[PDB]
């Protein structure tokens, strides 16, 4: 599957910027952030058509392997077969996700990690760049 | 200790660009590329003053945990404190390392890996950006 990065040491307030190519026939893509694959403060899942949703962003946490309560957004600034960029940061209370087209939303920080050490990508998205603050 | 990235799927001819800030008091830094931590097609180690060398790039391979034969460059386009970007690519014959100041050198491809899946950074270099093209 997609790129996996560890040992990231992203601190509160630091921005993690990811640019990638959405596949022409994309169904969805994922960015996961947290401590490890079983402990995610953010699962970020734009669904073009996948997992029972169309053109919807679904976010969740994972704690000791258990998905939390889902959150769905009402905006979908992504298109199959294009370049897309997202930027993420956090504090003890919320993650902030910066989308294309100036849209931004918050997702609650339910793990309270001191630092985000793990990121992974998956689905129909080819990472072109990852920038750290 | 720095970022570790896996599942990179870097293919021959593709460029991996890594940009970081060299510490103001830097002794050395490392970029490791290969299959996993024990199997490196390139250990890239600019030594300001470390491991017995001054202002020298040392490169090596690692196969099943064992270091190969060292290769030393004469060029040293790095300065303590300064941002630096290094770009790496490979073919079946050699890795090519593109340095600051327009310099490039080749290092033999000793492991014949189909793809480079692993990168890690270490020492006195704070990673700012990793790009794939
Ligand atoms: O909540 C987020 C998750 O929702 C469901 S599981 C789920 C369903 C209903 C509820 Cl009420 C809950 Cl709490 C969880 C997805 O299957 C899962 N998911 C996508 C993928 C994936 C990997 S690569 C690709 O393109 N999609 N891997 N796991 C995840 O997005
Ligand atoms: O060949 C490359 C290696 O040369 C010597 S061991 C070595 C010595 C003599 C010979 Cl003949 C051989 Cl074959 C191997 C270094 O100790 C080692 N090295 C650096 C570091 C390190 C980590 S972060 C930082 O800034 N430097 N961790 N291991 C590596 O550079």
Curated annotation (Swiss-Prot), chains A, B:
The keyword Zinc-finger does not apply. Keywords: Acetylation, Apoptosis, Cytoplasm, Extracellular matrix, Lectin, Phosphoprotein, Secreted. This is Galectin-1. GO terms for molecular function: lactose binding; laminin binding; receptor ligand activity; RNA binding. GO terms for cellular component: collagen-containing extracellular matrix; cytoplasm; cytosol; endoplasmic reticulum lumen; extracellular exosome; extracellular region; extracellular space; galectin complex. SMART domains: Gal-bind_lectin, GLECT. It is found in: Secreted, Extracellular space, Extracellular matrix; Cytoplasm; Secreted. Homodimer. Binds LGALS3BP. Interacts with CD2, CD3, CD4, CD6, CD7, CD43, ALCAM and CD45. Interacts with laminin (via poly-N-acetyllactosamine). Interacts with SUSD2. Interacts with cargo receptor TMED10; the interaction mediates the translocation from the cytoplasm into the ERGIC (endoplasmic reticulum-Golgi intermediate compartment) and thereby secretion. Interacts with CD69. SUPFAM superfamilies: Concanavalin A-like lectins/glucanases. It comes from Homo sapiens (Human). The modification Phosphoserine is found at residue 28. Lectin that binds beta-galactoside and a wide array of complex carbohydrates. Plays a role in regulating apoptosis, cell proliferation and cell differentiation. Inhibits CD45 protein phosphatase activity and therefore the dephosphorylation of Lyn kinase. Strong inducer of T-cell apoptosis. Plays a negative role in Th17 cell differentiation via activation of the receptor CD69. The modification N6-succinyllysine is found at residue 106. Residues 2-133 form the Galectin domain. A beta-D-galactoside binds at residues 43-47, 51, 60, 67-70. GO terms for biological process: apoptotic process; cell-cell adhesion; myoblast differentiation; negative regulation of T-helper 17 cell lineage commitment; plasma cell differentiation; positive regulation of apoptotic process; positive regulation of canonical NF-kappaB signal transduction; positive regulation of inflammatory response. The modification N6-acetyllysine is found at residues 11, 27, 106, 126. InterPro entries: ConA-like_dom_sf, Galectin-like, Galectin_CRD. Expressed in placenta, maternal decidua and fetal membranes. Within placenta, expressed in trophoblasts, stromal cells, villous endothelium, syncytiotrophoblast apical membrane and villous stroma. Within fetal membranes, expressed in amnion, chorioamniotic mesenchyma and chorion (at protein level). Expressed in cardiac, smooth, and skeletal muscle, neurons, thymus, kidney and hematopoietic cells.
